[PDB]
Structure 1
């Protein structure tokens, strides 16, 4: 059996992102997978990395260092419960799907907040214990992104550059760093201006891909894959 966590970042359930999340739950549940959804806006998920993320005595209350304090709080079991709840969902997952609209060539801040606060030292990685030795090794991760910009816009010679260029901080700096095996991203280009038929085709392509998701190999998460260098 497999456990899937869907980390979802969209305000509107009737949106195209909402439809992609719903077909992921539908298809994976049909396969007999165990499915969990962290609907960040519905949870009013806290995005800010603050001293409220530590419930116990701070290691150094004179000079607050978020990384040091959260690492110590993880080992002491004194992290805020909203962080621990997400870490339990991640720890048990075989696959983590991130479903979000592209905001400024990145994740919406609420999802950036989940990354910043949930993936702390001792949990996601350690020093040493990062990249191929990351603590989330063996787990799969997949970015399912929607854009405003068209596929043509997202080309080497297009105004936005190749879509792989913006994946680097998420895929390499974050997911690879934590030891995830990164599956090929699902990019659904410009659904808002696409036709009804094209929108249906994009949802069908995602549902169809999920049917064989457990057969895929991860991408080689390198500078050459992202930039051709």
Structure 2
């Protein structure tokens, strides 16, 4: 009996995206998960960080710094009721599903803001315990994305280039960075040009995947241990590590590709 959070980001109950989340929650429940949702549009959600994210007095209103004030606000418990109720949903979850349409090659603005407003220092990340040492280490996150263009268009020779680089800033920068383990993305390509019968199976496969999803092995990111964590060493990869790698033909990651070959589907397949 674990705990799932489904974050949607689509205006229409009409959308395949909405179907995807409804399918997501049904599957989850019949296997006994308790499920909570953040339907951003339906929530009248405000996606813009500002001082107004802070209940009371600002430490230094003369020179507003979002990072420090929000953190303080988080500690003293002075955050817009808004943010508070989301942050709670998070700590309570084991799994977090992010459901969205790909918009300009990343997350919708409203989803982006949700990260920016909900993922507050101390609560979600730490400068000390960055990445795989994050507060979310006990949790798993996954992107379920739908797309206009085809797998072909997003393949190594496709006009849009590799979908793995496009996934990187989000899956690593935003999910792994907070500690999350990230499962392979669910990618629904060319959803506008999928015959009506494939679209009924896709929803079904998604539901099957969900039945055993806690047991999947996650995407691979280069451990934080491979790096010297300070401004002295530059947060750089240890010499001993940079050395074992001299003769390995593939980089470690998309981000840590090292001028070498990116390991096939590093951001798409475990």
Q: Match of 2:208, SS?
A: helix
- Long gaps (5+) in structure 1: none
1:169 aligns with 2:169: yes
1:199 aligns with 2:194: no
Map of 1:68 onto structure 2: 68
2: CA distance, partners of 1:105 / 1:124: 25
Q: Match of 2:137, SS?
A: coil
RMSD after superposition: 1.2
Q: CA deviation at 1:201?
A: 2.5
Q: CA deviation at 1:182?
A: 0.5
The one-character-per-residue Cα deviations of 1:21-47 (angstroms, maximum 9, x if unpaired) are 011010001101000010000001110
2: CA distance, partners of 1:198 / 1:189: 12
**Greater RCO structure (CA 8 Å; 6+ sep):** 1
Map of 2:139 onto structure 1: 139
Q: Match of 1:159, SS?
A: coil
Map of 2:103 onto structure 1: 103
Q: CA deviation at 1:54?
A: 0.6
2: CA distance, partners of 1:201 / 1:150: 18
* Largest Rg, 1 or 2: 2
2: CA distance, partners of 1:35 / 1:199: 24
Shift >2 Å, 4+ stretches: 221-227
1:49 aligns with 2:49: yes
TM-score (norm 2): 0.82
Contact 1:171–1:221 (CA<8 Å) still a contact in 2?
no
Q: CA deviation at 1:224?
A: 3.8
2: CA distance, partners of 1:199 / 1:163: 21
Moved more, 198-207 or 112-121: 198-207
Moved more, 115-124 or 214-223: 214-223
The one-character-per-residue Cα deviations of 1:140-172 (angstroms, maximum 9, x if unpaired) are 000000001111001011011122111111111
2: CA distance, partners of 1:27 / 1:202: 13
Contact 1:141–1:175 (CA<8 Å) still a contact in 2?
yes
1:5 aligns with 2:5: yes
2: CA distance, partners of 1:129 / 1:56: 29
1:78 aligns with 2:83: no
Q: Match of 1:144, SS?
A: strand
1: CA distance, partners of 2:214 / 2:122: 28
